[model samples]
Target chain A: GFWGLEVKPGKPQAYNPKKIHVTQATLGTGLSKEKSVIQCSIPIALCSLLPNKIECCPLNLEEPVEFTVTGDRSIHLSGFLE
Target chain B: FWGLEVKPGKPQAYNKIHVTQATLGTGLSKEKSVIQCSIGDKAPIALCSLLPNKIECCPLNLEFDDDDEPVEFTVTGDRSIHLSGFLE
Candidate 1:
């Protein structure tokens, strides 16, 4: 009976180590120029959902860092990690 | 000897009239059609003085018509009267 979790390396290695369960495995591009350009595309989708005109938070920065999200089925989540 | 105080014209007339006291005045000018010129003319002398920023009082008006409202004047910076008109 197969009762225990099994994890096998997708690629064969010269010396295999003990296996552990990995529900998800992802391999993507690192932080190269192409990766940064791809990451910046997220704001395009985000900006379209905002109102045509609105006031943002008052923070002294080189550029505006505050934005409001407005659209159908909108969800706003703001928090500080540190 | 003056025995009585002069009431003068009706307060309404005084209120309608705009008394612009030029405490200070300044003027400027240029000279000559030539590309190069000397100090041929002198500039006009500008006056300067301290004035009340604003004064609002209901003085009598000579032409107290049915349309005239209370008169108001706004004194700007350095005591300059920018506006003096009836306020509805």
Candidate 2:
């Protein structure tokens, strides 16, 4: 299965581990020329979403997590569900 | 079956990764693009710098150790930087 979400700036989104077992995760943006940021606490990490830039991340978690986007653009987070 | 779209002006975090390489998109630009990574609330770290029409995909072998912490991978410039890797 595939799971994806569009995280807006200043907004927080929850990814429940019980809901889906994400095997792969990705962070990206739509159509913008500026830089954006996506961050999370658990497994603490932060990434910048440059225009037309996309990031791929692999995950294996057992707890709930929350994602946040920074800047004036929205970033897309999608991945594989196992 | 793993991919994401990173836009400009924002930093996005996926899960975590032991990135093996990065793929650049064929956008309408010729400027050099930079990708960076950060842990928790720390400053961003430059992963790689790619050039358009010259270098598309770059090889990387980086790992993270955030048992319960999230990690993020981002890019700079006006192009899409696609990073791919495996989970081990």
Candidate 3:
């Protein structure tokens, strides 16, 4: 019940809660690629003490680690089961 | 099972894949809860927009072929609006 789309750096994507979903996602194998990153909700107003809104640099997060697929999750990473 | 359901939306996108099953019969609100479906062909049509006091139902089925293209549905009104189906 999902799909995947690679987001190039500097290309911002907006997510409206009412529509979208995702279970998990993993960067496809690539060459010369030091790491891949996935980010959610950029900081705006009162951007302080915000813990969850962070980047997903492979440097911080390694490969093939399973993520959440809990029901009612409207976060559409656009990635499906591999 | 309240699973894989198409809840209320301006137009919930629907891709029919051999889906030919529906179960209904709940004349609710006593006012109205219109559930409209659009194959994106003609203007959006209604499955059970109204009843003759008795033939009302829920999750109404439509004989959609596997070759059928996707469609959309818009739910207006209230509670009586319920839909449940799946892809083949």
Candidate 4:
């Protein structure tokens, strides 16, 4: 448990590596004034945890990857690995 | 070497092991902002207590113990807590 999980709102979470190391996606723990997005494509990161701010990137995964969470609460995609 | 911004009550000077992300500032004053971090003089580690649009990070493999010593970002209630990180 290196710490992470929360991609279900607009639903599109999929990443199975079993190794651990996602780095960051940014913003969570909602009151959600609006705008809570998370999109990942291959090696591209389109983050927008807007209510205030955030842009912590580095999802350098290998193969299994997919994310497209929408806004309205439940939008915290974390990361880390030893 | 990445980023660091702890201004609004002045107390910004830090890092040892990448604790990236923690922002709460657009200043319209909803009050209720907190971000205390410390090292040298010890005692000052609240890390996050925002409530104005709330944007937070730093949650996995948050490694610390670098002895890089020297950190601070003391705030109470007046809005302003933009703590970004990366010293690796």
Candidate 5:
């Protein structure tokens, strides 16, 4: 059998103290709002990219029709599946 | 122009969800337990592998006042990054 290792949250190396947030205001009738905010330092080596593809099922009428990012930094958006 | 289509969710012919669960137990002085779980009935079809790379940088002790420690960084490609094949 394969064994798994444990990991613990440690001090964030090179902490830049920057915040990039995204929010989903509304969701479907049975679904709850899926809001996520990812905070990280700016001018880092890596940058978020557009999702290559996206797919969702059972369309909802009142679900948020679009996603928006608000902050000082610029973010790439793609792979939107309603 | 090839405009984007903002269509709502529709009946999925097939669905595949890829997730990674990581757990960390008590080990060193500064640590916290982390557990994650994901569920997807269908198996991954198109797996995108991010090229493995590394960076060389100065290291510091876990606490303080220690010799240089070797540090390694690995980035794994998200299995759900790209979906082009069928899922059953």
Candidate 6:
């Protein structure tokens, strides 16, 4: 029950599922000081991450969701299906 | 029935906000990382805390209003803190 994806800048990813839970989101390790932002389609989460390393807690979205990231590097997202 | 101009205090005008994320920066510190917002001469309101290597997704409920007074957001500790949310 593991689901993950690499979300890049300007590219939006859609999560279509019967039921899922987003447990963690970690930023890619990079030397750049640029900050990244992650937003969802249903206005659920709008999170910003600092470069080098950053991780966040769980997010619950019972419906279909679309995620977008804005920054230099990409963020790796992982979760589970319920 | 007396016909005089009548006015009741306008319902609080504001936006409903949900704080969904808080991320910390590289410069780690021992002090607690707190996210807060301030308006005019009022005291700052704490949103949440961001620990090292961990992203906080507490989901705080806050009411936002900006008519004449501007609001400012700040974070404690020397490290960078990113607080992101939406208005509903």
Residue by residue across B9-28, what tens digits does model 4's lDDT show? Answer: 77777544655455554457
DockQ of 5: 0.03
> How far does residue B63 in candidate 6 sit from its true spot (Å)?
16
lDDT of each: 0.18, 0.59, 0.35, 0.56, 0.18, 0.54
Scored by TM-score, the top model is 6
Clash counts per candidate, in order, are 11, 39, 5, 0, 4, 2
> DockQ of each candidate's interface versus the true one?
0.00, 0.03, 0.01, 0.14, 0.03, 0.18
Q: B1-88, model 2: which lDDT tens digit per residue?
A: 1334555458887654466556565467888889887888899889888776555556566665557466676778888776544455
lDDT of 5 by residue, A1-82 (tens): 1211111122232311222211111111222122111112221111111122111111101111122322222232222222
For candidate 3, write residues B1-88 as lDDT tens digits. Answer: 1112344445677553422222122324444446677786768886665331222222233555656577786665543333433343
Query: Clashing residue pairs, candidate 5?
Result: A7-B24, A59-B9, A82-B8, A82-B9
Task: Tell me the docking grade of candidate 5.
Answer: incorrect
In terms of docking quality, how is candidate 2 classified? incorrect
TM-score of candidate 6 against the unseen true structure: 0.49
Each model's fraction of native contacts = 0.00, 0.00, 0.00, 0.06, 0.00, 0.21
lDDT-better candidate, 5 vs 6: 6
lDDT string for model 6 (A1-82, tens) is: 8888778777677755465555566776556667666666543234556564544445432254667876777777787887
> Which portions of model 3 miss their true places by more than 4 Å?
A1-82, B1-4, B16-30, B50-61, B84-88
Query: How many Å off is the CA of B4 in candidate 3?
Result: 4.6
Question: What would the C-alpha RMSD of candidate 1 be, to one decimal place?
Answer: 32.0
Tens digits of per-residue lDDT for model 2, A3-28? 76777777587755433433333445
Expressed as tens digits, the lDDT of each residue in B1-88 for candidate 6 is 0001111122121123444455454453655667666676678777677565444334444445433356566666665554344444
Error of 3 at A47 (Å): 48
Best by lDDT: 2
Winner on TM-score (3 vs 4) = 3
Best by DockQ: 6
